[PDB]
Amino acid sequence: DNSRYTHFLTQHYDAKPQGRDDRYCEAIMRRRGLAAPCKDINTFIHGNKRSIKAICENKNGNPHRENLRISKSSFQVTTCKLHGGSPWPPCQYRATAGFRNVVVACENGLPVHLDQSIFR
């Protein structure tokens, strides 16, 4: 019943990146299965999982807009944005490293969606 949380981790969590440059994005977007077709934009959250799960409770989150949650703490993040016109591989990505709060949707106390709009 929490497979969407696993999918969230696969799409949006990378605990200990080093670089976070373009080549980081190119490699991780392939590894996580987001490169056929190339996903237009995708953000990874870094650090520990517990802080991310805590966004689903008062501990580290507030309600946001119609049905989302927004974190109290800031996270290291990396956003990978597709460069080029083709949605098909090879997928070239531009990396933008950041440090800010994140917006998620939660179900059963677990994140299951990242709102990408804040990273555009």
mmCIF file of C-alpha atoms in Angstrom:
data_model
loop_
_atom_site.group_PDB
_atom_site.id
_atom_site.type_symbol
_atom_site.label_atom_id
_atom_site.label_comp_id
_atom_site.label_asym_id
_atom_site.label_seq_id
_atom_site.Cartn_x
_atom_site.Cartn_y
_atom_site.Cartn_z
ATOM 1 C CA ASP A 1 0.000 0.000 0.000
ATOM 2 C CA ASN A 2 3.063 2.349 0.179
ATOM 3 C CA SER A 3 4.576 1.613 -3.258
ATOM 4 C CA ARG A 4 4.041 5.327 -4.141
ATOM 5 C CA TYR A 5 6.447 6.167 -1.272
ATOM 6 C CA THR A 6 9.042 3.794 -2.814
ATOM 7 C CA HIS A 7 8.453 5.456 -6.217
ATOM 8 C CA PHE A 8 8.910 8.854 -4.478
ATOM 9 C CA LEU A 9 12.318 7.731 -3.128
ATOM 10 C CA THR A 10 13.386 6.379 -6.546
ATOM 11 C CA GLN A 11 12.360 9.587 -8.310
ATOM 12 C CA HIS A 12 13.211 12.214 -5.661
ATOM 13 C CA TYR A 13 15.733 11.014 -3.033
ATOM 14 C CA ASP A 14 19.528 10.745 -3.209
ATOM 15 C CA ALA A 15 21.027 10.635 0.228
ATOM 16 C CA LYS A 16 24.686 11.530 -0.303
ATOM 17 C CA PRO A 17 25.445 13.006 -3.748
ATOM 18 C CA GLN A 18 28.935 14.360 -4.268
ATOM 19 C CA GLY A 19 29.212 16.658 -7.282
ATOM 20 C CA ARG A 20 25.668 17.718 -8.344
ATOM 21 C CA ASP A 21 26.906 18.940 -11.729
ATOM 22 C CA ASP A 22 25.449 18.218 -15.159
ATOM 23 C CA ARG A 23 27.140 14.789 -15.366
ATOM 24 C CA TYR A 24 25.565 13.931 -11.948
ATOM 25 C CA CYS A 25 22.102 14.640 -13.367
ATOM 26 C CA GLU A 26 22.802 12.665 -16.605
ATOM 27 C CA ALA A 27 23.902 9.588 -14.685
ATOM 28 C CA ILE A 28 21.225 9.605 -11.982
ATOM 29 C CA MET A 29 18.332 10.297 -14.395
ATOM 30 C CA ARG A 30 19.414 7.138 -16.367
ATOM 31 C CA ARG A 31 19.944 5.040 -13.175
ATOM 32 C CA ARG A 32 16.491 5.954 -11.724
ATOM 33 C CA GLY A 33 14.700 5.092 -15.002
ATOM 34 C CA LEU A 34 13.775 8.681 -15.887
ATOM 35 C CA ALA A 35 15.553 8.761 -19.281
ATOM 36 C CA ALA A 36 13.163 6.923 -21.656
ATOM 37 C CA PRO A 37 11.419 9.185 -22.394
ATOM 38 C CA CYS A 38 13.608 11.923 -20.840
ATOM 39 C CA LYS A 39 11.780 13.611 -17.951
ATOM 40 C CA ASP A 40 11.709 17.360 -18.546
ATOM 41 C CA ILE A 41 12.559 18.362 -14.931
ATOM 42 C CA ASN A 42 13.211 16.367 -11.836
ATOM 43 C CA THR A 43 14.454 17.309 -8.410
ATOM 44 C CA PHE A 44 16.319 15.082 -5.927
ATOM 45 C CA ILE A 45 16.267 15.763 -2.204
ATOM 46 C CA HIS A 46 19.458 14.975 -0.216
ATOM 47 C CA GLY A 47 20.073 14.198 3.424
ATOM 48 C CA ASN A 48 18.251 11.830 5.671
ATOM 49 C CA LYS A 49 14.871 10.195 5.024
ATOM 50 C CA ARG A 50 13.386 10.846 8.485
ATOM 51 C CA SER A 51 13.349 14.633 7.849
ATOM 52 C CA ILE A 52 11.499 14.059 4.588
ATOM 53 C CA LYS A 53 8.880 11.795 6.166
ATOM 54 C CA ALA A 54 8.462 14.396 8.950
ATOM 55 C CA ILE A 55 7.054 16.850 6.448
ATOM 56 C CA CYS A 56 3.901 14.717 6.618
ATOM 57 C CA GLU A 57 3.452 15.742 10.309
ATOM 58 C CA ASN A 58 3.626 18.940 12.354
ATOM 59 C CA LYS A 59 7.259 17.981 13.190
ATOM 60 C CA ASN A 60 8.567 19.278 9.878
ATOM 61 C CA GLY A 61 5.613 20.375 7.811
ATOM 62 C CA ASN A 62 2.637 22.681 7.429
ATOM 63 C CA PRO A 63 -0.456 22.306 5.235
ATOM 64 C CA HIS A 64 0.007 24.044 1.849
ATOM 65 C CA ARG A 65 -2.648 25.151 -0.724
ATOM 66 C CA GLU A 66 -5.525 22.687 -1.428
ATOM 67 C CA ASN A 67 -4.009 19.417 -0.198
ATOM 68 C CA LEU A 68 -0.171 19.582 -0.164
ATOM 69 C CA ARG A 69 2.416 19.897 2.622
ATOM 70 C CA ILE A 70 5.411 22.256 2.788
ATOM 71 C CA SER A 71 8.512 21.597 4.875
ATOM 72 C CA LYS A 72 9.639 23.760 7.766
ATOM 73 C CA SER A 73 13.327 22.847 7.315
ATOM 74 C CA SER A 74 15.408 23.578 4.208
ATOM 75 C CA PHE A 75 16.943 20.680 2.251
ATOM 76 C CA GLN A 76 19.883 20.406 -0.104
ATOM 77 C CA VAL A 77 18.360 19.621 -3.464
ATOM 78 C CA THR A 78 19.432 19.184 -7.057
ATOM 79 C CA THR A 79 17.202 19.969 -10.026
ATOM 80 C CA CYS A 80 17.964 18.278 -13.374
ATOM 81 C CA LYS A 81 16.457 20.143 -16.355
ATOM 82 C CA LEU A 82 16.386 18.599 -19.824
ATOM 83 C CA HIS A 83 18.404 20.390 -22.499
ATOM 84 C CA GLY A 84 17.514 19.863 -26.168
ATOM 85 C CA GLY A 85 14.302 19.356 -28.102
ATOM 86 C CA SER A 86 14.024 15.568 -28.072
ATOM 87 C CA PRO A 87 12.097 13.671 -25.358
ATOM 88 C CA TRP A 88 14.139 10.587 -26.316
ATOM 89 C CA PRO A 89 17.642 9.572 -25.139
ATOM 90 C CA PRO A 90 20.373 10.447 -25.003
ATOM 91 C CA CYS A 91 19.083 12.914 -22.351
ATOM 92 C CA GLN A 92 21.392 15.858 -21.640
ATOM 93 C CA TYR A 93 20.629 17.610 -18.306
ATOM 94 C CA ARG A 94 21.562 20.963 -16.718
ATOM 95 C CA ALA A 95 22.002 20.717 -12.944
ATOM 96 C CA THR A 96 20.935 23.428 -10.510
ATOM 97 C CA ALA A 97 21.883 22.812 -6.866
ATOM 98 C CA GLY A 98 19.714 24.502 -4.250
ATOM 99 C CA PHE A 99 18.878 24.741 -0.564
ATOM 100 C CA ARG A 100 15.230 25.388 0.367
ATOM 101 C CA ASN A 101 12.045 23.901 1.718
ATOM 102 C CA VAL A 102 10.078 21.401 -0.342
ATOM 103 C CA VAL A 103 6.425 20.812 -1.243
ATOM 104 C CA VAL A 104 5.064 17.233 -1.223
ATOM 105 C CA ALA A 105 1.789 15.351 -1.011
ATOM 106 C CA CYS A 106 1.521 12.756 1.740
ATOM 107 C CA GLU A 107 -0.498 9.561 2.146
ATOM 108 C CA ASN A 108 -0.447 7.328 5.232
ATOM 109 C CA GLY A 109 2.217 9.586 6.707
ATOM 110 C CA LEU A 110 4.599 9.148 3.731
ATOM 111 C CA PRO A 111 5.538 11.448 0.817
ATOM 112 C CA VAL A 112 4.135 10.254 -2.469
ATOM 113 C CA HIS A 113 4.467 13.266 -4.784
ATOM 114 C CA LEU A 114 6.930 16.151 -5.184
ATOM 115 C CA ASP A 115 5.572 19.471 -6.494
ATOM 116 C CA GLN A 116 8.054 20.326 -9.267
ATOM 117 C CA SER A 117 6.628 23.799 -9.892
ATOM 118 C CA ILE A 118 8.743 25.402 -7.179
ATOM 119 C CA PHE A 119 11.926 24.264 -9.025
ATOM 120 C CA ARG A 120 10.985 25.819 -12.390
#
